[PDB]
Design a protein around this ligand. Structure first.
Ligand SMILES: CCCCCCCC/C=C/CCCCCCCC(=O)O
Ligand SMILES: CCCCCCCC/C=C\CCCCCCCC(=O)O
Ligand SMILES: [Cl-]
Lengths: 183, 186
């Protein structure tokens, strides 16, 4: 039964949530994932940006990718998306752990760890602004008059599915373009 | 003595080191023109590693080769901080910059607002210019060692930056998707 996924909701909101929850289950999402995510609207879109629901600790990342734990935690701080600053706290999205684990390779090439950590810090800040600009841009395109939660979920998955393949190549090209025009 | 007009107003140790640097840059295919235009010319031989092959195109060439509409192309070039604003047949655009800017169109084709699309470029470019600054200082710090000649630095930056480039692209992509995941869950 869905009802506990629906909770306190009533009226039109509960009816729209029912049809959304129904579509997500067919999408292969669990009751378990829907409870932990409010609103459940973006569950069939987050996997397109690499959130599969898996979480890891800094120590797991360290051992699994063979990187220095302390350096890793500096990078996690510099990105600044999860707090719990405990090496055994399982609070990092898998893809975030793996991304943070790349930083050490720059260090092994002789780059200064302080400076690497600083770059990550400035990049994260610049990208967090672009992210928010990106969010608004996408919403404008998805959000149409009188749309239900399910309409929005379907429209978001379609649009983000088409955008994601382009975003990676683009950001990469934009970085190298800035690096071509240093001085 | 053609090299002489490429040393500028330098003197002493620094003039003779600039001479050795210039002789090597020329061996790399950097033209006297490229050297004169770029001052200090120290990382002219690292430039190709970040996508500058010294080939240039016009906006018309960009619009036709890469598929983009010429009006959008100009807007994106403004947002990025490049050639203030030119003539369609003027061959003043780095080829890789034209490819980069032309990707704007595909986003518009998916039904994204052209104004918002240009806005995102503007905001992204702002963030990345700062990142690029700090990246340069990082790389420079790693190669600079006392007793380093200008040529030593040039060659050391080639060796080092050549190893860094393949890591950078995936790096920045991951750092974008990391922000998108955080914003989505937030
Ligand atoms: C987790 C992210 C770690 C960030 C690591 C820091 C990045 C290293 C910096 C890149 C150095 C390459 C810069 C090359 C300058 C090119 C200038 C030119 O000659 O045109
Ligand atoms: C001039 C060309 C610049 C192109 C910039 C790309 C524009 C990207 C627009 C949005 C893509 C971001 C996708 C994630 C947005 C959040 C979606 C959601 O949570 O509903
Ligand atoms: Cl000089």
């Amino acid at each position: 039964n869905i009802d506990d996924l629906l909770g306190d909701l009533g009226g039109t909101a509960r009816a729209e949530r029912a049809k959304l929850v129904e579509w997500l289950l067919e999408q292969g999402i669990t009751p378990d994932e829907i409870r932990a995510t409010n609103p459940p609207l973006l569950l069939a879109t987050r996997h397109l940006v690499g959130d599969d629901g898996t979480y890891v600790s800094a120590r797991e990342i360290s051992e699994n990718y063979g990187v220095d734990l302390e350096l890793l935690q500096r990078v996690q701080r510099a990105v600044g998306l999860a707090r719990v600053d405990d090496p055994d706290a399982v609070v990092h999205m898998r893809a975030d752990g793996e991304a943070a684990a790349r930083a050490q390779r720059f260090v092994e090439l002789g780059l200064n760890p302080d400076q690497v950590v600083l770059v990550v810090r400035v990049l994260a800040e610049g990208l967090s602004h672009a992210a928010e600009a990106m969010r608004y841009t996408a919403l404008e395109a998805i959000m149409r008059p009188g749309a239900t939660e399910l309409d929005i979920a379907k429209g978001s998955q379609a649009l983000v599915s088409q955008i994601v393949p382009l975003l990676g190549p683009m950001i990469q090209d934009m970085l190298f373009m800035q690096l071509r025009h240093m001085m």
